[PDB]
Ligand SMILES: CCOC(=O)[C@]1(CS)N[C@@H](C(=O)O)C(C)(C)S1
Ligand SMILES: [Zn+2]
């Protein structure tokens with residue numbers, strides 16, 4: 172695909188059906204799925220796959236159940252370990268559109284409690300479990316059982332009021348989801364669900380929560396350096 176929004180395909184990318192997978196680190200891969208929007212073309216959305224010992228952890232579904240089932244198929248082929256859990260980073264179609272494929276496979280799913288509360292209104296299937304957060308934004312660990320290397324952080328409202336972010340312990344990788352755009356981005360996208368007053372602070376909070384991450388993975392750009400966080404925050408400063 173040659174998406175209008177999202178990175179092009181590069182050497183080292185693997186095509187598996189209509190999905191693209193890229194290894195980012197020895198136990199981390201980016202999954203990419205595409206949704207065609209009329210007149211506007213293909214929009215890429217990225218999530219993560221993490222191998223944690225004898226199990227696999229997933230961050231975000233694909234746009235659709237069928238695509239998300241193909242993520243599970245790719246995992247079976249390339250990793251061949253059971254998927255223990257998935258965490259989805261807000262209640263939009265690119266992040267939660269494939270929940271049914273996860274639940275059909277018996278995979279435990281997790282989301283911000285607010286994401287689960289909003290899911291019906293957003294046309295999404297709620298996750299099976301709800302994460303809650305301390306006042307400093309870090310997940311309450313009782314609500315993130317056996318998350319292994321996944322360090323979940325709620326940076327505050329930005330892209331949506333429920334957006335969460337995930338650091339991958341033992342790697343240089345932090346996932347900003349749809350909150351962060353890369354340093355070449357010209358806009359933060361549509362902003363219809365956004366908190367334009369708090370966006371900038373939330374972007375900076377994400378950077379401060381994962382201060383040593385050097386590879387920033389995001390939903391709608393290829394991985395970038397930490398400049399993606401600052402550039403996003405500075406674009407968000409102009410919304411106030
Ligand atoms: C089907 C709903 O999914 C969307 O429309 C997203 C989800 S974040 N929002 C858009 C935006 O923020 O402009 C986008 C093009 C980045 S994908
Ligand atoms: Zn979104």
Ligand SMILES: [Zn+2]
Nearest residue numbers: 263265349390
């Ligand atoms: Zn998105």
